[PDB]
Amino acid sequence: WKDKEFQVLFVLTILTLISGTIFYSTVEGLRPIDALYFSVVTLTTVGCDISPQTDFGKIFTILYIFIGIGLVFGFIHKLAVNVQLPSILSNL
């Protein structure tokens, strides 16, 4: 968690999710929790059962995916290392 590389990826991920939450809650009229949910399932590629209704929201979502998918998967990978390492080091 002290690893600056992990810390920066965390910050970038949080900032990207905040931006999506603000966007979808104000332009697409979603409750904050639903805007955050939509942002997360979009950038992790899980998807969900809704899509943006406005043209602005569709264009934003296209750009958001290309801006954010690589960072989010970089963060998920670094997070996975941190989470599994204590179990690996106990199982040695």
Residues lying near K ion in the complex (CB under 5 A) are found at 45, 47
Helix ranges (H only) for the chain are 4-26, 32-43, 55-90
Q: Say what the alpha-carbon torsion angle 51, 57, 74, 17 is, to the nearest 10 degrees.
A: -100
State yes or no: residue 29 binds Na ion (CB under 5 A). no
Q: How many CB atoms lie within 10 A of CB 52?
A: 19
Nearer to a second copy, 26 or 70 (CB): 70
3-state secondary structure of 63: helix
Which residues ranging from 9 to 68 are in contact with a second copy (CB under 8 A)?
Answer: 9, 11-12, 33-34, 36-37, 40-42, 44-52, 55, 58-59, 61-62, 65-67
* Residue nearest K ion, CB atom distance: 45
* Per-residue binder mask for Cl ion (CB under 5 A), 35-64, x = binder: ------------------------------
